[PDB]
Amino acid sequence: GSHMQDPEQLKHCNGILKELLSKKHAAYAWPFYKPVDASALGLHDYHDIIKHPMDLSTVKRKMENRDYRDAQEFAADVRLMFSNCYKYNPPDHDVVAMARKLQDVFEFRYAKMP
Amino acid sequence: GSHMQDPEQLKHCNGILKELLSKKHAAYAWPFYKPVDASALGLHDYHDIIKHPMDLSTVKRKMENRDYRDAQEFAADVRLMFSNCYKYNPPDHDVVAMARKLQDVFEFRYAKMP
Ligand SMILES: Cn1c(=O)c2[nH]cnc2n(C)c1=O
Numbered sequence: 001g002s003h004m005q006d007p008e009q010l011k012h013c014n015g016i017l018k019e020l021l022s023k024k025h026a027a028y029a030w031p032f033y034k035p036v037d038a039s040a041l042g043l044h045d046y047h048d049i050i051k052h053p054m055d056l057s058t059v060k061r062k063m064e065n066r067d068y069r070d071a072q073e074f075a076a077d078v079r080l081m082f083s084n085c086y087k088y089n090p091p092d093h094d095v096v097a098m099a100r101k102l103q104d105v106f107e108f109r110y111a112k113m114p
Numbered sequence: 115g116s117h118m119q120d121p122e123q124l125k126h127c128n129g130i131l132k133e134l135l136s137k138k139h140a141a142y143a144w145p146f147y148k149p150v151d152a153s154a155l156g157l158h159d160y161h162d163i164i165k166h167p168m169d170l171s172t173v174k175r176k177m178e179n180r181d182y183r184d185a186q187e188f189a190a191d192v193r194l195m196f197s198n199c200y201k202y203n204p205p206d207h208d209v210v211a212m213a214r215k216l217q218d219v220f221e222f223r224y225a226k227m228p
């Protein structure tokens with residue numbers, strides 16, 4: 001059920017999303033900008049292992065289209081994106097190191113929800 | 115709607131929970147074992163800042179009582195527990211360092227969901 005706080009909480013989510021896409025974090029956010037192109041990257045098992053792909057451009061489209069009804073729905077998609085990275089790649093992969101840094105940005109600001 | 119995979123996914127969640135409570139992680143998991151006793155700790159603003167407290171003993175009770183209907187519901191509570199820590203405490207607090215380590219244990223194993 002919609003709560004009167006949902007629009008303002010979704011604005012905070014949109015602010016987080018803008019930050020995740022901003023130049024400040026680009027050195028470690030770039031793998032998450034667009035859907036994994038598994039074939040182009042030679043990751044021919046990606047879609048067998050990752051049944052629910054997610055990336056920031058998809059989160060952005062869903063925000064713009066008002067798909068997310070509350071902050072929790074938005075956060076679940078962002079976390080799914082990171083979990084897919086942790087599931088698919090070995091834990092010492094540089095993309096995992098980047099995911100952990102970007103997820104720290106996300107989690108600490110999401111925790112500051114007004 | 116319940117899916118036939120939900121019992122086995124909740125068993126994986128229960129395994130994660132058991133690991134989070136195990137001696138292997140006790141050096142950094144202990145702050146999360148029981149509800150924050152705000153008055154006893156002198157944290158007299160805790161319940162003004164944290165509107166939804168969560169801790170591992172509460173997650174355990176909810177698992178034992180079949181409160182969680184799927185893995186996503188379980189994960190949201192575990193993540194709420196960590197987010198409360200990130201919200202309430204300064205980011206250099208030792209309890210935050212412990213939360214980040216325990217959350218890494220959680221996220222990497224949750225990502226290995228069968
Ligand atoms: C360093 N780096 C890369 O190595 C890379 N590869 C693809 N986009 C990239 N971007 C945006 C980037 O900043």
Ligand SMILES: Cn1c(=O)c2[nH]cnc2n(C)c1=O
Nearest residue numbers: 031032036041085088089095
């Ligand atoms: C998200 N992601 C991955 O998980 C990954 N694994 C290997 N290359 C990868 N690339 C380029 C990527 O963007």
Ligand SMILES: Cn1c(=O)c2[nH]cnc2n(C)c1=O
Nearest residue numbers: 139140141142143144145147
């Ligand atoms: C080190 N340490 C502590 O400092 C502590 N304080 C309360 N429980 C505690 N436990 C279980 C612990 O291991």
Ligand SMILES: Cn1c(=O)c2[nH]cnc2n(C)c1=O
Nearest residue numbers: 145146150155199202203209
């Ligand atoms: C979870 N948590 C906290 O967030 C915290 N902040 C200060 N002491 C704290 N303690 C003992 C604690 O258990």
